[PDB]
Amino acid sequence: QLERLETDDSMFEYEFQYDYTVNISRSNKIIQKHRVTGNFTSERNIYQNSDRFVISYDTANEKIKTSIYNRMENAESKTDYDTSITLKDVTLSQLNSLIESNLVQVDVYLVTDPNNVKNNVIAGITKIEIDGTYEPL
Amino acid sequence: KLRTLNVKGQLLTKTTMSINNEDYYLFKFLVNNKSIDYYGTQTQFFSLINNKTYELVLQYSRKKLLIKSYEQCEDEDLLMTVCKSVTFQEFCANEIKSLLAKFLYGFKIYGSSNVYKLVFVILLEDNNGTINGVQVEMMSDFKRLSGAFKNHVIENENDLFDCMYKSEEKYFNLYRIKCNHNANNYKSLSLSSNSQLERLEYEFQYDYTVNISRSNKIIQKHRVTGNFTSERNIYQNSDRFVISYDTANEKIKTSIYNRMENAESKTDYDTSITLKDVTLSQLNSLIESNLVQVDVYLVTDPNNVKNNVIAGITKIEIDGTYEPL
Amino acid sequence: KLRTLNVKGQLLTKTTMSINNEDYYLFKFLVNNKSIDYYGTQTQFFSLINNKTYELVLQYSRKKLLIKSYEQCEDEDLLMTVCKSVTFQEFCANEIKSLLAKFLYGFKIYGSSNVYKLVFVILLEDNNGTINGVQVEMMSDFKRLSGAFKNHVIENENDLFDCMYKSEEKYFNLYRIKCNHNANNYKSLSLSSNSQLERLETDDSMFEYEFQYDYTVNISRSNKIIQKHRVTGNFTSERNIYQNSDRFVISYDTANEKIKTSIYNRMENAESKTDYDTSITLKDVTLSQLNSLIESNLVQVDVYLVTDPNNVKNNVIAGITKIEIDGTYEPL
Amino acid sequence: QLERLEYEFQYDYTVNISRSNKIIQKHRVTGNFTSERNIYQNSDRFVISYDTANEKIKTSIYNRMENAESKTDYDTSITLKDVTLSQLNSLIESNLVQVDVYLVTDPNNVKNNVIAGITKIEIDGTYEPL
C-alpha cells in the first residue's frame, strides 16, 4: 500500500537530503519532466539502427531536441503495428494545435544524461486535457 | 459545452486505412504552410477535392481532431499582399512572393560591368516555428534595378547609389520577389521584370546572425577612416590585392580577389588591374584630404575574422558623384 | 514485351491526390516486411480492403509500377515456419516468430536459484536492407526450459546443464519465440508456454554459409558481448566491498590470456534471514577452493564473461558453471 | 562546339575548382536502396542509403522545385517523388533499371555527402532523371 504522508512539519530537514543527482535505475542518466508550452514538432523518421520519432518542443526554460523509440505490446499476426504508429503520428502532429489553443497540456517525461544533454529520449507522455481526461501515449 | 477550432487551408492528400474493423479517413491539409492531418468520415471523403482551398471548423472529440463543417474558398491569391515572414519550404518551392524586408548596405560586385548586390534582412521561419532574422542577397542588373524602385527614378549608375544610401536601414515592402535555391543550396532573392521595391519609411528582431545566401559568412560595411594600404599579390592559389584599413573601432587586414568581365580577347585584364592599383594607392591620399569617403563591403566569418574577403568598395565623393570598384 | 513482377502483401493504406488535375491512386502495401508504394487505377482503390492480403501482379509502364492485376490470398500464417532472419520491425511489433538461430552459451545467472539464460546468434536485417549476425539473449525459468526442448526431456537442474553443453555451437530451430522491446530497449527473446526449442543436428550445408552468424554485437546488451572462457591456471578470488557495491575480485588464466574481473553479489529469496552474508561467505569458500580443484582436474570451470569488444579490460561475470568428473554440474 | 575525339596521367584530379573542398563522384547503385522523407530544422531532404560494389553509402539530397507557381505542386510533386524513390529497390533487384548516383563528396571527410542528381538507365533505352 502507498499512503501519502502529505504535508508535515520537519519537512525542511528532509528536503535538503532528498535532492538527487543520480538515478539507480538508469545507466548514468536521470529522468526529467518538462512542461511543453511552445512549438511541438513531430515527424516520423527511421534510422539505420531503429525506428524513432524526432521530437522537439519548448518549455518555460529552453528548447529540447529529442527522440522516442517506437514499439508495440501484444500485436500478433497483424498489420496493426504499422497502422497503429500512423495513428500516433497523426495524434502527435495534432498536439501542437491543442497546446496553442490550450485544449490540452503535455507532460514529456525525459530520460536524460546530466553531463551530455544531447542524450535525450522520451520515456512517456501524458496529455492533460481540460476535461480532466488523461490520454497518455 | 464542446470546443471547436476554425482553420482555412487547401487539401493535398486524403488517406484511408482500417484498424479493428474500423475504417478511418485522413486528410492532409496545407494550413499556414504546415502539413497537418485532420480526421474525417466517409461522407467528407467524397465531398472534398484535392488542391482546392477549404474553410474548416474543427472539433476535438474523443481525443482526436475531427472536421465538423467545411466550405470552399476559391483560388485565393496573396501576391502584392506583404507578409512579415517566409518559410524554408517556400525557398524550395521557389515561389513568387511580396514580403517585407529591411535594406542593408548595397554595393557593386567587383569586376562586374553591371552586377549590383543588395543585402536585405528577412524574417525567415524554420519548420519548427522559430522566426529568426537572417541576411539575404539580391543580385541584379542595372536594367531591372532602374525601374524596380517604386517612386524613385534612376537614369544612370550615379543615380542608383544615391537611392541605395538614402535607403540604408530603411524598411521596404518588396513586391513579386522570387525565392531561390541551388545545387549549392545558397538561398537568395532575385528580381523579375514585374517587381517593385517600395520605401516604407517593425517591432520584430531584425538582428541577423547568419546569411542564408552565404555558407558560414556574413556581410558588413566598414566606413574606412584611417590608414589605407594596398599592394597586388599573386599567390600559388589565386591573384589578389592585400588591403589594410582602419575604422573607428579597429584596423582590418583583408584581401580582395581579382577578376574581370567583358575584357575578352584583349590585354585589358592586365592593364585595367594595374590601373586599379593606382586608384587604390591613392585612396589614403584622398581620405586624409577628405576629398572622398570610402565604404568597404566585406564578407567576414563571424567565428574567425581572418577569413576576410572584400566584395565591393564604394567611393563617396564630395560633389555627389559615386565611383565603385 | 513490357516486363512484369509478382509480389504478395497486405494493403495498409490507400491514398489519392491530384497533380495539375490528374488523379493518382497509391497503395501502401506490405511486401516481405517492407513498406512499398504501388501505383494503381481508380478501380483497384475500391475493391481492395485494408489489412487484407492480396497477391499482386505489377507492371513497369510509364516509368511507374502499376498494379496490373490482383487476387486475394487470406491471412498467411508463418508460425512454425523457420526464417533465416528477422528484422528490427518484428521486435517492435513484439512478434511471436519462429526463426532459425544458433546456440552459443548457456548458464545460470549468479545469485539466482530458478532462472536460466541462453545465448543465441540470429540473423537480423537492418532497415537499410543489410543482414548481420547479432548475438541475442533470452531468459526463462527452469519449468519452461524443461519441456520446451523438443525431443529431450529435462527433469532436474543437472540434466538441463547436460542438455546445453552438447548443444553448444549447434543450430536451433526456434518455435514461437517472443521478440521484444523494453524501456531500456534491450531487444531480447522470451519463452512463451507454447514454444519448442529443437536441435537442427546437421552441421553440413544448410545456412552457416558466408559465416553470416558472426557475433560482433549483442542486441540485449549495451555495447558489450558475452564470451565463454575455459579456465586453465591460477584462479584468484577475494571479497571486496567498494563504496558503491559488494563484489568479488576474480582473476583467472586461460590458454589465451589472464583476465582480472569482478562479480556483483546478489541474493534471491532472503526472507527474514541474515543468510545473504552467510551464503556469500559460503560462496567465498567455494571460490578459494576452485583453484585447488582445477589444478587436480577434479573439476573444470567455464566463465561466461560480459566483455567490451574494444576496451576488453571491462569485465563483469554473468555466471559460473563447474563441470565435475562425475558429470554433475554446479552453477553459482 | 563540343567536338568528340597516355594523357590520363596528367588528367588525374584531386580538387574541383567549381566547388569548395568538394569533388563529384559517380556511383552505380548495386544493392539495397532506401529513401525516406525527412524534414530538418534547416532543410527538407531525402534520407538515402544505397550500395555500390565498393561499399555502402548513407547520404542526403536537398529538395527544391524550379518555378512551380500558384499551385500545391511542391507538396504533391514531392510526395510523388517519395513514391518513385521507394520503388527503385524493387526495380534494381529486377534489373528493369540501372541507377547512377552523382554525388558531391568531400575528399577529406566522407560524411559530407549530398546528391547533386540521379540518372536512371532503363532496359528499352529510355532515360529518366530526377
Residue C62, chain D, CB below 8 Å: the answer is no
**What whole-number distance in Å separates Cα of residue D127 and Cα of residue B209?**
44
Residues sharing a CB contact under 8 Å with residue C53, sequence separation 6 or more, in sequence order: C8, C9, C10, C72, C73, C74, C75, C76
CB-CB contact of C91 with C181 (8 Å): yes
Integer Cα distance of B190 and C12 in angstroms: 45
Quote the strand ranges of chain D, DSSP E: 23-29, 34-39, 44-51, 56-59, 97-105, 113-122, 127-129
Using DSSP bridges, classify how beta strands C131-141 and C188-199 pair: parallel, antiparallel or unpaired.
parallel
Give the whole-angstrom CA distance, residue B179 versus residue B97. Answer: 8
Calculate the alpha carbon distances from A121 to A42, A85, A118, D40 in Å: 14, 17, 9, 18
Phi, psi of B146, deg, nearest 5: -65, -45
Please answer yes or no on whether D91 and C36 come within 8 Å at the CB atom. no
Of A47, A49, A123, nearest to C183 by CB-CB distance is A123
Tell me which of D50, D74, D86 to substitute to probe the interface with C (most C C-beta atoms closer than 10 Å).
Answer: D86
Of A52, A26, A3, A37, the C-alpha closest to A114 is A26
Nearest CA in chain B to C22: B50
Q: List the chains bordering chain C where 3 or more Cβ pairs fall under 8 Å.
A: A, B, D
What residue of D is the nearest CA neighbor of C64? D84
Q: Region of C266 please: left (phi>0), alpha (psi -120 to 50) or beta.
A: beta
How many CB atoms lie under 10 A from the CB of residue C40? 24
3-class DSSP state of C41:
coil
CA distance C58 to B135: 50
- Chains A and C form CB pairs within 8 A to the count of 57
Nearest one of C304, C325, C299 to C116, comparing CA atoms: C304
Q: Which of B16, B19, B51 is facing C14, going by the closest CB pair?
A: B16
Given CB atoms, is D76 within the 8 Å cutoff of chain C?
yes
**Does residue B81 contact residue B167 with C-beta atoms inside 8 Å?**
no
Kind and range of the H or E run holding C321? strand C315-324
Chain A nearest CA to B11, separation (Å): 16
> Coil, helix or strand for B307?
coil
Q: How far apart are the first and last CA of chain D?
A: 27
Please report residues of C whose CB lies closer than 8 A to that of D82: 37
* Cβ-based neighbours of B229, under 8 Å, separated by 6 or more: B243, B244, B245, B284
| Alpha-carbon span B324 to B33, nearest angstrom | 42
| Cell, residue B176 | 513579386
Contact B104, B120 (CB under 8 A): yes
Using a CB-CB cut-off of 8 Å, the residues of chain A touching B40 are none
- Identify all chain C residues contacting D33, using CB atoms and an 8 Å cutoff: 129
Largest CA distance in chain B: 89
Could you list the beta-strand ranges (E) of C72-187: 85-87, 96-97, 100-108, 115-125, 131-141, 171-180
d(C-alpha B101, C-alpha B122), whole Å: 5
Please report where in the chains the cell 501502401 appears, as a residue: C28
The C-alpha cell that represents C162 in the structure block = 547436460
What chains are in contact with A, requiring at least 3 Cβ pairs below 8 Å?
B, C, D
Residues in chain D: 130
Q: CB of D5 within 8 Å of any CB in chain A?
A: no
Q: Of C135, C162, C98, which Cα lies nearest the Cα of C323?
A: C162
Contact between C133 and C123 under an 8 Å Cβ cutoff? The reply is yes
State the nearest Cα–Cα gap between C47 and chain D, in angstroms. 22
Q: Which grid coordinates belong to C223?
A: 555495447
Q: Calculate the CA dihedral of residues C135, C140, C141, C144 and round it to 10 degrees.
A: -120
- Which chains, if any, share at least 3 CB pairs under 8 A with chain D? A, B, C
CB-nearest partner of B94 from D39, D64, D70:
D64
Which residues of B fall within a CB distance of 8 Å from D43? Answer: 88, 185
Q: Tell me whether residues B16 and C51 touch, CB distance under 8 A.
A: no
User: How far apart are the C-alpha atoms of C323 and C321, rounded to whole Å?
Assistant: 7
List chain A residues with CB under 8 Å of D36. 45-46
How far apart (Å, rounded) are the C-alpha atoms in residues C206 and C100? 11
Contacts of B175 (CB under 8 A, 6+ apart): B80, B82, B98, B150, B195, B196, B197, B198
Angle at alpha carbon of residue A118, lines to A117 and A124, rounded to 5°: 85
What would the grid cell of residue B284 be?
589614403
Residue among C178, C172, C171 nearest C195 (CA):
C178
Cell 524602385 sits at which residue?
A: B149
Asked if C59 and C40 touch (Cβ cutoff 8 Å), the reply is no
Q: Give chain C's length.
A: 332
Alpha helices in chain C (DSSP H): 44-47, 88-92, 142-148, 157-165, 275-295
Query: CB A45 to CB D58 under 8 A?
Result: no
Interface check for A48 against chain D (CB to CB < 8 A): the answer is yes
- The one-letter amino acid at C281: T
Take residue B294 and report the three cell numbers written for it: 570610402
**What one-letter code names the amino acid at A7?**
T
Residues of D in contact with A52 (CB under 8 A): none
Give yes or no for a contact between C100 and C123, defined as CB atoms under 8 angstroms apart: yes
